[PDB]
Amino acid sequence: ECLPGSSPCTDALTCIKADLFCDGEVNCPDGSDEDNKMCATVCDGRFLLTGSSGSFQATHYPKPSETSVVCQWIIRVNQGLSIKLSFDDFNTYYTDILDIYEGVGSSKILRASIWETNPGTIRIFSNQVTATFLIESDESDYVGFNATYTAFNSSELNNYEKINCNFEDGFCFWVQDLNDDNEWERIQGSTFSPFTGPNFDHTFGNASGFYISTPTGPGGRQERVGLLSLPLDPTLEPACLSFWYHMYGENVHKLSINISNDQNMEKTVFQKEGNYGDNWNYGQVTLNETVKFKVAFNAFKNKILSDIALDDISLTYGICNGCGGPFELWEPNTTFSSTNFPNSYPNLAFCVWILNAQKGKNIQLHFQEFDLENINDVVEIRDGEEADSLLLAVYTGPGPVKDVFSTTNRMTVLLITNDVLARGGFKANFTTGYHLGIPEPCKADHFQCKNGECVPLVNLCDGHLHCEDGSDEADCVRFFNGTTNNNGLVRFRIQSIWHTACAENWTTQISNDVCQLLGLGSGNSSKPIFPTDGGPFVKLNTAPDGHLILTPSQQCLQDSLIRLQCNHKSCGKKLAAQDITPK
Amino acid sequence: IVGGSNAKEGAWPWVVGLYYGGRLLCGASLVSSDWLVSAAHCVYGRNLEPSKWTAILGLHMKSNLTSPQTVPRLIDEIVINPHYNRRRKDNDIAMMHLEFKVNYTDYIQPICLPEENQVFPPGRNCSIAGWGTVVYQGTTANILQEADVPLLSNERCQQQMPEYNITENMICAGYEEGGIDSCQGDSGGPLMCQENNRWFLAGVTSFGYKCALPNRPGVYARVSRFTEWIQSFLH
């Protein structure tokens, strides 16, 4: 009889520990500890799989699970080759954790745990992989799992196959870090802890895709999550690393990328801090190394509401780059003459081309040929959409007129022709679209003026002339609760907030200055009455340089609101040497 | 101006003579340092080449351009009214931008502007100007002429003009027996009316059935309705 907790071998001569049975190492002198009958699992009846391919299933795969059975599979393949695990189906309780050990014996290394999530394809780069499945739940609503193993050679893998991975079917070849604080979780669609992280996959543009992200668990401390890659071979030409990162959260600290070599020297080449919105950002970094290197996406995660996700990682060689005419027509009638256009047009011609489209689609009229007469003959392009026809442009004469961008879905064109000196004619073709002509306004608090350029705050009522249309200096200060036209408050606007102003150092000079800024004449008077606005009032000051310094400080005692009253400008007053004669 | 007399030199500094390659067509009204106000019927079809319009500021006689008070200016932009319609002659108003700035002088002064909701009573005496024609079938007048016409109500104007459609943006003005009214070549002149020692712009000569004819008043585009449209450009 052996010691308590130990089981003897078949020959009953050597006592070995209980945990040393079916672990991968031959402990009994006769090899009885590695016998397939003693380690026979009730899952599939197979323990040791030495073939190059096969399959394994749990207890009663095409049936509900009723008994908790401890099963273990040990696969040994030829040296130099890797084992590729393919999971076709996986639906079990979260208590039935599938442990994947790398190696045999007590030196086996755990790599990842699977529960309630389809792992897809998991590839281990070891010729001996030990998979153990422990059953803990008794719910008969699950079916089980069925996975197959295949052998492949990892030495023939190129840099593209090692780096380029869209994360749609598990991990291609990425190896999770072991010295980190937590491992990456493969979640499909929306994750836990809403209002943070991505809501849909970037590759497919929907919630049916798969990607990797930080564990959304309630971590009370700062946890580091890193993913290690395979050693890449040194190339003569540099390569650009392309990837899509999603950094949205309240507690986002920093997302950095470190490069590890054979000398354990880490070199940070990419770093991003702060919030970048709930949108996938295009990130790129040029990789130029003379020896073998590794790519490591090390994410430092803070407490709740700090989720970070990654998707679509790939590597590419090269440096990262930086009176009886026609009537209403439709889309199949883009190209059109007016009425008699293969040559000069006849006189007394008056046709109409009402261009129709869908509700919300403007019209872009491009002229391929435009040779008209003088001022007598013109073309009137309209945007009526109703009985009140508007005006767009008046083109005439032989010349390369610009494009015409409508606003509504209707455009009326009238051809006014004289009765003599018939010219050649015009020719055009339209193309329907969405918001054509008007450029897309830049987001992220980028103010757009009339000309189209972007000016957030470099010209928002400060004294510059960036926008040539003058819309950069548009309405920011105006009268508030004014009785007459040239009467009201001195409500200003710093960026967006329309607020009044203080009167700590109010004078007549700045009074007439504001009157001129308002478009009126000089300052006739200024009478403070009482404070009534609670907005961020600004103390208007002046400097000898000429400009007015307006510091929006919200701190003042017994403030007073100046009731500005500006006199009129240079109206129609006769200043010459005129007299009065009733004739 | 058919039944008027010669005006004093400098009595109307806000009357700009618009020449199209050396030929006066329609008067204007300088409001801003670089913006003008003219009728949108004479600039119809010429907005492609604004350089063909030469703005002569402070001119009195059309044959003394070498005066020391004349300041030559060019047009670089012609913004017709968005709601303009030549066939119905509606929204006859347009603004013409100037090339370079001009300093104010005794002969160069900006005209007034009519404020919104300004009650103009009928029969109010308004002054006009511009190098018009002294008769229907005649030639233009070299001297800057002037005249005076009373204001007629919209209903009475519509009854007197059944052939046209006087909208709510057209203020009519003219004598009952004719004789003194606008003529050809003068359509575009300002309609100046006195109010508290101020000469506003209460209309611009747009069109008319006939010139120097009884019971045929002139039509003036109500600038009072296009106040915000002009103010959006003066800045």
mmCIF file of N, CA, C and O in Angstrom, chain B residues 59-99:
data_model
loop_
_atom_site.group_PDB
_atom_site.id
_atom_site.type_symbol
_atom_site.label_atom_id
_atom_site.label_comp_id
_atom_site.label_asym_id
_atom_site.label_seq_id
_atom_site.Cartn_x
_atom_site.Cartn_y
_atom_site.Cartn_z
ATOM 1 N N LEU B 59 -19.559 112.081 -60.372
ATOM 2 C CA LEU B 59 -19.618 112.763 -61.655
ATOM 3 C C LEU B 59 -20.826 113.690 -61.717
ATOM 4 O O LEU B 59 -21.895 113.383 -61.181
ATOM 5 N N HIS B 60 -20.650 114.833 -62.377
ATOM 6 C CA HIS B 60 -21.722 115.802 -62.568
ATOM 7 C C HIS B 60 -22.131 115.936 -64.025
ATOM 8 O O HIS B 60 -23.319 115.811 -64.345
ATOM 9 N N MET B 61 -21.180 116.187 -64.920
ATOM 10 C CA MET B 61 -21.451 116.311 -66.346
ATOM 11 C C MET B 61 -20.718 115.197 -67.083
ATOM 12 O O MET B 61 -19.550 114.920 -66.794
ATOM 13 N N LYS B 62 -21.404 114.564 -68.033
ATOM 14 C CA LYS B 62 -20.860 113.427 -68.774
ATOM 15 C C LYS B 62 -19.770 113.817 -69.771
ATOM 16 O O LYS B 62 -19.330 112.939 -70.527
ATOM 17 N N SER B 63 -19.315 115.072 -69.812
ATOM 18 C CA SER B 63 -18.274 115.484 -70.747
ATOM 19 C C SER B 63 -17.106 116.162 -70.037
ATOM 20 O O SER B 63 -16.305 116.843 -70.686
ATOM 21 N N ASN B 64 -16.991 115.991 -68.723
ATOM 22 C CA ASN B 64 -15.919 116.603 -67.943
ATOM 23 C C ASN B 64 -15.313 115.570 -66.998
ATOM 24 O O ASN B 64 -15.135 115.809 -65.803
ATOM 25 N N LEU B 65 -14.995 114.390 -67.538
ATOM 26 C CA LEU B 65 -14.409 113.317 -66.742
ATOM 27 C C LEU B 65 -13.057 113.688 -66.146
ATOM 28 O O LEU B 65 -12.619 113.030 -65.196
ATOM 29 N N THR B 66 -12.389 114.715 -66.673
ATOM 30 C CA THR B 66 -11.091 115.130 -66.158
ATOM 31 C C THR B 66 -11.199 116.027 -64.931
ATOM 32 O O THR B 66 -10.223 116.704 -64.590
ATOM 33 N N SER B 67 -12.353 116.054 -64.267
ATOM 34 C CA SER B 67 -12.513 116.880 -63.083
ATOM 35 C C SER B 67 -11.637 116.351 -61.947
ATOM 36 O O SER B 67 -11.396 115.144 -61.846
ATOM 37 N N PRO B 68 -11.145 117.235 -61.074
ATOM 38 C CA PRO B 68 -10.351 116.783 -59.925
ATOM 39 C C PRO B 68 -11.158 116.060 -58.859
ATOM 40 O O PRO B 68 -10.562 115.517 -57.921
ATOM 41 N N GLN B 69 -12.485 116.039 -58.974
ATOM 42 C CA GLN B 69 -13.341 115.340 -58.025
ATOM 43 C C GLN B 69 -13.735 113.946 -58.490
ATOM 44 O O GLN B 69 -14.192 113.140 -57.674
ATOM 45 N N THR B 70 -13.570 113.648 -59.777
ATOM 46 C CA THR B 70 -13.932 112.337 -60.296
ATOM 47 C C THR B 70 -12.920 111.288 -59.855
ATOM 48 O O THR B 70 -11.712 111.449 -60.051
ATOM 49 N N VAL B 71 -13.418 110.210 -59.257
ATOM 50 C CA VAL B 71 -12.573 109.105 -58.810
ATOM 51 C C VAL B 71 -12.954 107.854 -59.592
ATOM 52 O O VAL B 71 -14.031 107.283 -59.363
ATOM 53 N N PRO B 72 -12.115 107.393 -60.519
ATOM 54 C CA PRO B 72 -12.478 106.228 -61.331
ATOM 55 C C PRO B 72 -12.391 104.932 -60.539
ATOM 56 O O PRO B 72 -11.440 104.697 -59.789
ATOM 57 N N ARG B 73 -13.405 104.087 -60.717
ATOM 58 C CA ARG B 73 -13.462 102.786 -60.068
ATOM 59 C C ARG B 73 -14.027 101.764 -61.042
ATOM 60 O O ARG B 73 -14.768 102.101 -61.970
ATOM 61 N N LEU B 74 -13.669 100.504 -60.820
ATOM 62 C CA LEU B 74 -14.092 99.401 -61.668
ATOM 63 C C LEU B 74 -14.970 98.436 -60.883
ATOM 64 O O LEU B 74 -14.951 98.413 -59.649
ATOM 65 N N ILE B 75 -15.742 97.639 -61.614
ATOM 66 C CA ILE B 75 -16.618 96.637 -61.020
ATOM 67 C C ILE B 75 -15.949 95.274 -61.138
ATOM 68 O O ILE B 75 -15.382 94.938 -62.183
ATOM 69 N N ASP B 76 -16.011 94.486 -60.060
ATOM 70 C CA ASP B 76 -15.393 93.165 -60.036
ATOM 71 C C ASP B 76 -16.386 92.071 -59.656
ATOM 72 O O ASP B 76 -16.006 90.898 -59.587
ATOM 73 N N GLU B 77 -17.646 92.425 -59.415
ATOM 74 C CA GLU B 77 -18.650 91.441 -59.033
ATOM 75 C C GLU B 77 -20.035 92.033 -59.250
ATOM 76 O O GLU B 77 -20.287 93.182 -58.879
ATOM 77 N N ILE B 78 -20.922 91.240 -59.851
ATOM 78 C CA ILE B 78 -22.302 91.649 -60.084
ATOM 79 C C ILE B 78 -23.233 90.595 -59.502
ATOM 80 O O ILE B 78 -23.413 89.519 -60.084
ATOM 81 N N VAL B 79 -23.826 90.893 -58.351
ATOM 82 C CA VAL B 79 -24.691 89.958 -57.640
ATOM 83 C C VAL B 79 -26.131 90.362 -57.927
ATOM 84 O O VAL B 79 -26.657 91.309 -57.337
ATOM 85 N N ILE B 80 -26.775 89.642 -58.838
ATOM 86 C CA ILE B 80 -28.184 89.865 -59.135
ATOM 87 C C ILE B 80 -29.025 89.292 -58.002
ATOM 88 O O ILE B 80 -28.580 88.418 -57.251
ATOM 89 N N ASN B 81 -30.247 89.793 -57.869
ATOM 90 C CA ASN B 81 -31.135 89.314 -56.818
ATOM 91 C C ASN B 81 -31.488 87.850 -57.065
ATOM 92 O O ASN B 81 -31.779 87.472 -58.208
ATOM 93 N N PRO B 82 -31.467 87.001 -56.034
ATOM 94 C CA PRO B 82 -31.795 85.580 -56.248
ATOM 95 C C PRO B 82 -33.205 85.353 -56.767
ATOM 96 O O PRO B 82 -33.429 84.426 -57.556
ATOM 97 N N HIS B 83 -34.163 86.171 -56.344
ATOM 98 C CA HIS B 83 -35.545 86.036 -56.783
ATOM 99 C C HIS B 83 -35.861 86.870 -58.018
ATOM 100 O O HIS B 83 -37.037 87.146 -58.276
ATOM 101 N N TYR B 84 -34.847 87.275 -58.780
ATOM 102 C CA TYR B 84 -35.077 88.110 -59.951
ATOM 103 C C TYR B 84 -35.786 87.322 -61.048
ATOM 104 O O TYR B 84 -35.636 86.105 -61.169
ATOM 105 N N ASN B 85 -36.570 88.041 -61.853
ATOM 106 C CA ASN B 85 -37.277 87.441 -62.983
ATOM 107 C C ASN B 85 -37.482 88.540 -64.022
ATOM 108 O O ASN B 85 -38.334 89.414 -63.840
ATOM 109 N N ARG B 86 -36.698 88.489 -65.102
ATOM 110 C CA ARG B 86 -36.775 89.513 -66.138
ATOM 111 C C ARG B 86 -38.131 89.558 -66.830
ATOM 112 O O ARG B 86 -38.641 90.656 -67.077
ATOM 113 N N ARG B 87 -38.722 88.407 -67.143
ATOM 114 C CA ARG B 87 -40.007 88.352 -67.828
ATOM 115 C C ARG B 87 -41.135 89.011 -67.049
ATOM 116 O O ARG B 87 -41.980 89.680 -67.652
ATOM 117 N N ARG B 88 -41.169 88.841 -65.729
ATOM 118 C CA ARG B 88 -42.150 89.518 -64.894
ATOM 119 C C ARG B 88 -41.619 90.811 -64.292
ATOM 120 O O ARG B 88 -42.378 91.517 -63.619
ATOM 121 N N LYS B 89 -40.344 91.131 -64.516
ATOM 122 C CA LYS B 89 -39.699 92.334 -63.991
ATOM 123 C C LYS B 89 -39.781 92.418 -62.470
ATOM 124 O O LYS B 89 -39.842 93.516 -61.908
ATOM 125 N N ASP B 90 -39.784 91.274 -61.793
ATOM 126 C CA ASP B 90 -39.877 91.250 -60.344
ATOM 127 C C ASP B 90 -38.487 91.153 -59.718
ATOM 128 O O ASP B 90 -37.546 90.617 -60.311
ATOM 129 N N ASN B 91 -38.373 91.688 -58.501
ATOM 130 C CA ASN B 91 -37.111 91.714 -57.759
ATOM 131 C C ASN B 91 -36.015 92.411 -58.562
ATOM 132 O O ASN B 91 -34.874 91.948 -58.635
ATOM 133 N N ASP B 92 -36.368 93.541 -59.172
ATOM 134 C CA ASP B 92 -35.422 94.303 -59.977
ATOM 135 C C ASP B 92 -34.464 95.078 -59.080
ATOM 136 O O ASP B 92 -34.645 96.279 -58.858
ATOM 137 N N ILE B 93 -33.441 94.398 -58.561
ATOM 138 C CA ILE B 93 -32.455 95.029 -57.694
ATOM 139 C C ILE B 93 -31.180 94.202 -57.759
ATOM 140 O O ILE B 93 -31.223 92.972 -57.831
ATOM 141 N N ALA B 94 -30.037 94.886 -57.747
ATOM 142 C CA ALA B 94 -28.747 94.218 -57.824
ATOM 143 C C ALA B 94 -27.686 95.098 -57.182
ATOM 144 O O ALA B 94 -27.838 96.320 -57.098
ATOM 145 N N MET B 95 -26.609 94.462 -56.728
ATOM 146 C CA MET B 95 -25.485 95.151 -56.111
ATOM 147 C C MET B 95 -24.228 94.888 -56.926
ATOM 148 O O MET B 95 -24.012 93.766 -57.398
ATOM 149 N N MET B 96 -23.404 95.921 -57.090
ATOM 150 C CA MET B 96 -22.180 95.840 -57.876
ATOM 151 C C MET B 96 -20.998 96.199 -56.987
ATOM 152 O O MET B 96 -20.948 97.301 -56.429
ATOM 153 N N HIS B 97 -20.054 95.271 -56.857
ATOM 154 C CA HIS B 97 -18.879 95.486 -56.027
ATOM 155 C C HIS B 97 -17.852 96.342 -56.760
ATOM 156 O O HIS B 97 -17.715 96.274 -57.985
ATOM 157 N N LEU B 98 -17.127 97.152 -55.996
ATOM 158 C CA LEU B 98 -16.088 98.016 -56.534
ATOM 159 C C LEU B 98 -14.729 97.335 -56.440
ATOM 160 O O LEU B 98 -14.520 96.425 -55.633
ATOM 161 N N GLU B 99 -13.799 97.788 -57.281
ATOM 162 C CA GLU B 99 -12.458 97.218 -57.318
ATOM 163 C C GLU B 99 -11.627 97.689 -56.132
ATOM 164 O O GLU B 99 -11.164 96.872 -55.328
#
